[PDB]
């Protein structure tokens with residue numbers, strides 16, 4: 001009876017196995033755009049993905065991860081609110097059953113159709129498993145998806161999903177350039193938070209871009225054909241794999257822009 005996104009095992013149940021679910025810096029949160037303060041001391045983000053080496057795509061039973069070679073400084077996030085260098089390890093998405101829901105963060109209570117998470121770990125802790133034990137261990141770049149025009153740079157991901165339909169399936173996924181998933185502007189909001197899936201560790205500096213990317217209805221419909229279940233098991237479509245907004249508590253959201 002493992003955690004997931006159902007009635008009997010969804011987000012309102014996670015606290016029984018993971019008591020930090022009710023902690024002081026949980027994610028996601030609603031971003032109240034009028035309350036977020038412009039912090040003129042924040043720096044421009046530095047997103048350096050030109051040497052990124054993608055390896056594999058995995059259906060892990062709760063999302064799909066596009067995994068990168070993180071054995072060297074090849075794809076790194078620095079600047080903005082960050083001290084030091086964070087290495088890209090994977091990206092994944094969270095999405096809905098319908099276009100009106102799917103994002104984890106919200107903006108003035110608005111839900112987007114999906115949300116991309118580019119996960120990076122702080123190289124001063126040496127490995128990802130050590131980094132998640134630290135309050136500044138991870139930096140996650142969050143990007144909202146709205147449905148409209150297709151995102152050309154997403155199509156290579158969309159077209160491999162039929163090969164990883166069910167939990168535990170993986171496929172080779174080399175030479176994928178994550179620069180084709182970025183919006184034009186790197187304006188962002190930032191706050192201290194957590195992983196949005198168990199173990200819900202409070203180790204993340206969140207950097208949430210203001211500008212959403214557009215994807216087509218056909219692109220998101222293919223996300224919604226994935227399965228939470230393993231091969232041969234009753235089909236349960238992989239939809240609504242998002243955690244709702246959590247209490248902000250004693251936190252301030254800072255804006256990079258006026």
Ligand SMILES: [SeH]Cc1ccccc1
Pocket residue numbers: 117119138140195196197
């Ligand atoms: Se919800 C972002 C995230 C997912 C898996 C591991 C680290 C961070």
Ligand SMILES: [Zn+2]
Pocket residue numbers: 092093094117196
């Ligand atoms: Zn995520």
